[PDB]
Amino acid sequence: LNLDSIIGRLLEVGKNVQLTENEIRGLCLKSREIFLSQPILLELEAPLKICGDIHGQYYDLLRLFEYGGFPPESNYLFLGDYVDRGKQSLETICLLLAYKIKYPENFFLLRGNHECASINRIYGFYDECKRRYNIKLWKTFTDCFNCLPIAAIVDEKIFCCHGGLSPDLQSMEQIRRIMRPTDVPDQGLLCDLLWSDPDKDVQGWGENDRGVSFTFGAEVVAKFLHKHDLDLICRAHQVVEDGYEFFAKRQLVTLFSAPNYCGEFDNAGAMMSVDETLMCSFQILKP
Ligand SMILES: [Fe+3]
Ligand SMILES: [Fe+3]
């Protein structure tokens, strides 16, 4: 009944929700256990709703649940980037962790490049934690982030991750052998899964403007799907005007779930529903 009270307070509502340090610490400790007990490559089954980046936009997260259904009315896969930039990362991550604890088999969260301590320091989560609580709580979130799964396959056909593909990715077993907990390295497989972007104008692998990881073209996607017998790559990590955006003739979709991203864009947010026959549709949240 501790958990339902945390949930009730989170849903009660820029107006903050300040839970207690012990509650938040319990959310990190318990969710971290569940993450580590579940595989690092999730095997999920439709029907499911899939969401892109939130970046602390807590009112938009509650909006996504209004559109999609509060759990356990729908099953969820989130693709990362819960924290940083927005004004309410603490409420966002804590509702996500509360749902994962209460619904461990029907609510799933992947690791984004922002679920990384070094990126947090720079992009606001460290500061939000230090201000509202203390640096040690931030360390507790960090240790929890280091245990998140990295990718998911829905019904053997949809490959999901925050960023994209890697040139070092030859078999799915490489992903399964990634040890947790771990920080995200500056280069290599785990990095690439969290950081890579598709690019229309590149062929093969390219230099990525971010100064981290790579870009990959349409041909890389077609080869990856064919090789691994998949129909779709579902990823996030880039703001797209319509909330979702296809690439490589519908073989890759980018999802982004934070409308009016960071005050600075006029984008819709989208959420992708996958039904039991693997049909994909989109609910759109305009800014
Ligand atoms: Fe992001
Ligand atoms: Fe990202």
Q: Ligand 2 centre and the CA of 86: distance in Å?
A: 14
* 277 C-beta neighbours (distance < 10 Å), count: 8
Instruction: Phi first, then psi: give them for residue 239, nearest 5 degrees.
Output: -65, 135
Q: Give the range of the structural domain holding residue 259, as residue numbers without chain letter.
A: 1-287
- Rounded CA-CA distance 69/168 in Å is 38
In sequence order, what are the beta bridge partners of 252?
Answer: 233, 247
In DSSP terms, 42 is beta-bridged to 152
Chain mean position to CA 265: 20
Q: How far is CA 118 from CA 29, 56, 274, in A?
A: 21, 17, 34
Nearest ligand, measured from the Cα of 197: 2
Distance CA 162, CA 109 (A): 10
Around ion ligand 1, residues with a beta carbon closer than 5 Å are 53, 81
CA atoms of 220 and 202, how far apart (whole Å): 10
Residues in CB range of 219: below 8 A, 6 or more apart? 203, 204
- Counting ligands in written order, the one closest to the CA of 84 is 1
Instruction: Determine the distance separating the centroid of ligand 2 and the alpha carbon of 2, expressed in angstroms.
Output: 32
Question: How far, in Å, is the centroid of ligand 2 from the Cα of 256?
Answer: 10
Q: Assign residue 127 the CATH number of its domain.
A: 3.60.21.10
Instruction: Judge whether 53 is annotated as a binding position.
Output: yes
What one-letter code names the amino acid at 168? D
Q: Which H or E element spans position 48? A: strand 48-51
- Please choose, from the candidates 29, 27, 34, the residue with its C-alpha nearest in 3D space to the C-alpha of residue 7: 27
User: 185 C-alpha vs ligand 2 centroid, how far in Å?
Assistant: 15
* Rounded Cα–Cα distance for residues 73 and 16 (Å): 26
- Around ion ligand 2, residues with a beta carbon closer than 5 Å are 81, 112-113, 237
DSSP code of residue 50 = E
As given in the structure block, the two tokens for residue 200 are 């229309």
The structure was resolved experimentally with X-ray
226 tagged catalytic: no
Full strand arrangement of the beta sheet holding 244-247 = 41-44, 151-154, 158-160, 232-235, 252-255, 244-247
CB count, 10 Å around CB of 11? 13
Q: Which of 161, 164, 144 is nearest to 152 (CA)?
A: 161
Residue identified by tokens 């990634």 is 178
Q: How far is the CA of 125 from the centre of ligand 1 (A)?
A: 13
DSSP output for 217-271? -HHHHHHHHHHHT-SEEEE-SS--TTSEEEETTTTEEEEB--SSGGGT----EEE
**Residue count (the chain):** 287
Task: Please state the domain count of the chain.
Answer: 1
User: CB-based contacts of 175: which residues, under 8 Å, 6+ apart?
Assistant: 40, 41, 150, 151, 169, 189, 193
Which residue in 32, 49, 100, 114 is the catalytic one? 114
